[PDB]
Design a protein around this ligand. Structure first.
Ligand SMILES: O=C(O)Cc1ccccc1
Ligand SMILES: [Ca+2]
Lengths: 193, 557
């Protein structure tokens, strides 16, 4: 069947999802993630959207403000809205899968609720496609592809010019923060390109 | 993050071998999540960070893929021109343009709420403003508006069956990331993926540009421009966040450089060493590189030359002889807390002293603090990520190369003194410092080993577990957060593919309300520490053969 989602766990607990369509396949994935890593995922959702002070307090206000100032939520929603129904299924399947398991947990918290929700004094909320997308955006795009120190570099360069004068300040800048160095060991050999 | 890919011509008893060690820090519960997907055109196995829809590490029985951080320059800062009167406007192409703005309310558990505004221009969100210059800085990313497409390219690539299909997906991944390929036929490939700006002529990407119009990027460079290799003449592909290719410019980070001193050399040495490598040998490179001091190789010749005319009773000469006798591989003593040889401690003190006398001296305060680290960092919990050669150390290496270095020495870092005299002065400092703490008998120096901590707070510094959930490993290992190996066409099996991984502490982070920990909460922790690994299953018969449980759902959209 098309309604059927079979979940097989191996000797390490690693889940394997058997499904006939995209929505059912990502629903299965979403479901096991909510089983295995709900507190982690929940904290990862608040970290990537800047909503930690709500449950954790005063100490995270600066963190929350810094996260919100580094993205444009509306630009992310517009990319979601432009997806094709097959692409959209991935994200919707996933959020739906998670929600299915959050509903049972929230229904039977005396045995299903992750101990840390009790510790931290809050409970899990339902997910939407925007939340799934933000997990990737916040931990892959901001943590590994958002690197610059240009303002700082300018500050440094300005200090080298008041020390060595204008032309000298610039040549020292090139010695400390060169653009390229032809002796750098490379992944692609020079014969290749 | 490191990777080594071995093709047909370098592989022994297989056609292709892929070993990946993504480095993201050590966390409890595991940074990555193990998952197999079978249906809707997908047939994959692997693990991926934060259980993203697409698997960063894994294979589909035909091809295998992996990644390492790219570090290309894909972000530039635009100095936006503001008017004192007419606020929330900026000058662009001779018109006063209005900024996008949004208000935000930060709700605070047990405190008052807080609201602020976020501003944005054509170039990007505003970082900071200088109302004295009447300048606002906007951070411009080449991948702005392709975030979602990058996620989907990472998902769709799992279905590729060849290089041709695989690169159609690589062309849509817009973040600066290295992608790797291997297949059942022994083919191997590499692509430095990402969206890079087509800059205006005379744009120096290390420094801000005016955002008034003339400095605006021309667009984005085509994918034909992205560094890539297929079936390289060497038989292998190695990367440890080094330069992709000759003359490729790195990130603008002051602290990031691609120079003659690079930790990828440590991988290359080992792969060129043996004409062919087996899977056990390819796996074994993790153990060696985990334990290798990264500075020994770079400065041993320099220290040797400087102490050559010194006497045997000279302590500065003794210290160099200790290092000469050493292979650079750190091993713990029986005590589980100290290293067998004092090499790293010596290089650490020497290097700190050397930096203070050379690079630090040439830079004005407080910029001098950026170049003073030796790269031996750590605290009690050990390093937060990988060990690397510090920026100051890469700059000092070029200086000690003298004229063999391609980098013009605008200021002589040795400030008119012969090299040997600065080296010997730092060696005197070293001896004075270390002998004071450990005594005069170098042979009984029991130096402190670095440790490994699986942190309860995620990389943002936000709790993702209870503090008590923190795990400790005695030996610091400069390796992936996870390690995975894929072997295509083993001669050793009937199986066309064999794959292994390790996801520590375990698959599950579940703790029941009563304090009852899941069965798979920490069953991979000891395996991690002793360089072990678990089989990854793809086919139904393997999965069936190894099943521990089954759950069937009947759901309709
Ligand atoms: O190299 C890194 O810092 C970690 C990493 C691995 C794979 C992809 C992105 C980042
Ligand atoms: Ca830049």
């Amino acid at each position: 069947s098309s309604s059927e989602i079979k979940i097989v766990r191996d000797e390490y607990g690693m889940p394997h999802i058997y499904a006939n369509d995209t929505w059912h396949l990502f629903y299965g994935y979403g479901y096991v993630v909510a089983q295995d890593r709900l507190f982690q995922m929940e904290m990862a959702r608040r970290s990537t959207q800047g909503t930690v002070a709500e449950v954790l307090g005063k100490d995270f206000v600066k963190f929350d403000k810094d996260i919100r100032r580094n993205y444009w939520p509306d630009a992310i929603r517009a990319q979601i809205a432009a997806l094709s129904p097959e692409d959209m299924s991935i994200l919707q399947g996933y959020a739906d899968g998670m929600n299915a398991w959050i509903d049972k947990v929230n229904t039977n918290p005396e045995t299903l609720l992750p101990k840390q929700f009790n510790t931290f004094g809050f409970t899990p909320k339902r997910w939407e496609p925007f939340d799934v997308a933000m997990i990737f955006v916040g931990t892959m795009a901001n943590r590994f592809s958002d690197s610059t120190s240009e303002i700082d570099n300018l500050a440094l360069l300005t200090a080298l010019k008041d020390k060595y004068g204008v032309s000298q300040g610039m040549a020292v800048f090139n010695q400390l923060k060169w653009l390229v160095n032809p002796s750098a060991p490379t992944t692609i050999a020079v014969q290749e390109s | 993050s490191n990777m080594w890919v071995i093709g047909k011509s370098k592989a022994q008893d297989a056609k292709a071998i892929m070993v990946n060690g993504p480095q993201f820090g050590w966390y409890a519960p595991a940074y990555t999540y193990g998952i197999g997907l079978h249906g809707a055109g997908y047939d994959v196995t692997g693990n991926t960070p934060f259980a993203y829809p697409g698997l960063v590490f894994g294979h589909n029985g035909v091809i295998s893929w992996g990644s390492t951080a790219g570090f290309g320059d894909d972000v530039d800062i635009f100095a936006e021109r503001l008017s004192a009167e007419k606020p929330g406007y900026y000058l662009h192409n001779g018109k006063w343009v209005k900024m996008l703005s949004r208000e935000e309310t930060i709700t605070v558990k047990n405190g008052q709420a807080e609201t602020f505004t976020v501003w944005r221009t054509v170039h990007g969100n505003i970082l900071q403003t200088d109302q004295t210059t009447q300048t606002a800085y906007a951070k411009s990313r080449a991948w702005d508006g392709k975030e979602v497409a990058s996620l989907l390219a990472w998902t769709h690539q799992m279905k590729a069956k060849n290089w041709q299909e695989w690169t159609q997906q690589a062309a849509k991944q817009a973040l600066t990331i290295n992608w790797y390929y291997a297949d059942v036929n022994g083919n191997i490939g590499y692509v430095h993926t990402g969206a890079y700006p087509d800059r205006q002529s005379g744009h120096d990407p290390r420094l801000p540009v005016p955002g008034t119009g003339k400095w605006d990027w021309k667009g984005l460079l085509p994918f034909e421009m992205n560094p890539k290799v297929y079936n390289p003449q060497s038989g292998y592909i190695a990367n440890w966040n080094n330069s992709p290719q000759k003359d490729y410019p790195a990130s603008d980070l002051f602290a990031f450089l691609w120079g003659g001193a690079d930790r990828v050399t440590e991988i290359d040495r080992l792969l060129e060493q043996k004409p062919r490598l087996t899977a056990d040998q390819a796996w074994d490179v993790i153990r060696q590189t985990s334990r290798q001091d990264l500075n020994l190789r770079l400065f041993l010749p320099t220290l040797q030359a400087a102490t050559s005319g010194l006497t045997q009773s000279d302590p500065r000469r003794q210290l160099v002889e200790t290092l000469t006798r050493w292979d650079g591989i750190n091993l713990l003593n029986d005590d589980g807390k100290t290293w067998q040889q004092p090499g790293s401690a010596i290089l650490n003190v020497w290097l700190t002293s050397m930096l203070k006398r050379t690079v630090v001296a040439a830079v004005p305060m407080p910029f001098d603090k950026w170049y003073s680290a030796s790269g031996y960092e750590t605290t009690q919990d050990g390093p937060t990520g990988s060990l690397n050669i510090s920026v100051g150390a890469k700059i000092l290496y070029e200086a000690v190369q003298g004229d063999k270095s391609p980098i013009p020495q605008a200021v002589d870092l040795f400030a008119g003194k012969p090299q040997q005299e600065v080296v010997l002065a730092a060696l005197e400092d070293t001896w004075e410092t270390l002998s004071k703490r450990y005594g005069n008998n170098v042979s009984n120096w029991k130096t402190p080993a670095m440790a490994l901590t699986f942190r309860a707070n995620n990389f943002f510094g936000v709790p993702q577990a209870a503090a008590e959930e923190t795990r400790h490993q005695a030996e610091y290992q400069n390796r992936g957060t996870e390690n995975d190996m894929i072997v295509f066409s083993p001669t050793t099996s009937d199986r066309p593919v064999l794959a292994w991984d390790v996801v520590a502490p375990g698959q599950s982070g579940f703790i029941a309300p009563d304090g009852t920990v899941d069965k798979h909460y920490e069953d991979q922790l000891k395996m991690y520490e002793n360089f072990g690994r678990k089989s990854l299953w793809l086919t139904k018969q393997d999965v069936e053969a190894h099943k521990e449980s089954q759950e069937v759902l009947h759901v309709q959209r």
